[PDB]
């Protein structure tokens, strides 16, 4: 229900330091 | 070895 | 993880450290997919050339954890063995071949900031995001280099290859339900998992939800971050039909 949403970065709305290079490659 | 020995209850 | 950083604290709450009993040692990595199952490479469990084919006691699953070798008191959890399921056509005499294990624990291990399931992907999501060139990240515990052990979790993203090129750089038979991942010489940047990361998760970002979904297991290679070379990953998505038929079996 609750998979993949890490509590200290998704639950909190925020982004880990690379995390955007791999949204980056999804082109 | 390297690793700290952990609780012996597990 | 050769040419990784250092995890940021609950980057990687699914990740999951395979434990040796006596002598108290770290055997591999493996990932949590839910509050009772464990995943990972069959061959961190059963390999007979190395003499290796543990049984559920001889093994403890410690969860939670940043630290490699310290025992993080009040945040890491350590989970006993019910039992360890091998696909039964794991292929250890040839090339690794549906290299996946679930591991049952005996209690429910209890979510924390540091411990929560990774999602397995759905048909539509890895048609999606199983592309060369998407990147996907690999967490471990093992070797800083082919030829020493790092002090915490580590983490390194990695662009998945193109099936011919994985092919092209290897004598040994690729399946389907195998992908490799990492850098071209031609592309600079470099990485890779290593011996001690095995079963540990290879996992993706599903832009489309937001959600962590682990799409490979650390399987294997030949060294570790060589030039031409590239790491092997269980492909998760082909061998969903057996995880299901466990978990809704047992
Ligand atoms: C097939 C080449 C040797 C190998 O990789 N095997 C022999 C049977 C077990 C498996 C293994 O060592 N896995 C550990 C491993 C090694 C290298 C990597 C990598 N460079 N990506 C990943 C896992
Ligand atoms: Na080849
Ligand atoms: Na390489």
Known sequence: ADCG?????????????????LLESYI | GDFEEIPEEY | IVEGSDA???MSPWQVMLFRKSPQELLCGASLISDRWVLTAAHCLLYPPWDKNFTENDLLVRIGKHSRTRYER?????????????????????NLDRDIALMKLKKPVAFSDYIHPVCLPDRET????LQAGYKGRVTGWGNLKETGQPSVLQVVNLPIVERPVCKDSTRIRITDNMFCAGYKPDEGKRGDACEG?????????????????????????????????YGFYTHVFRLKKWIQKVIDQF
């Not at chain 3, 599903?206 to 971050?225: A, H, L």
């Open chain 1, 5 to 21: 949403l890490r509590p200290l970065f998704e639950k909190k709305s925020l982004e880990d330091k690379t995390e955007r290079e």
């Open chain 3, 74 to 94: 009040n945040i890491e959890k350590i989970s006993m063995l019910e039992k360890i399921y091998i696909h039964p056509r794991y292929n250890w005499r040839e």
């Open chain 3, 8 to 10: 940021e604290i609950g």
């Open chain 3, 126 to 129: 890895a048609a999606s995001l």
């Open chain 3, 197 to 229: 990361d095995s079963g540990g998760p290879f996992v993706m970002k599903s832009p489309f939800n937001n959600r962590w979904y682990q799409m490979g297991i650390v399987s294997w290679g030949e060294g570790c971050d060589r030039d031409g070379k």
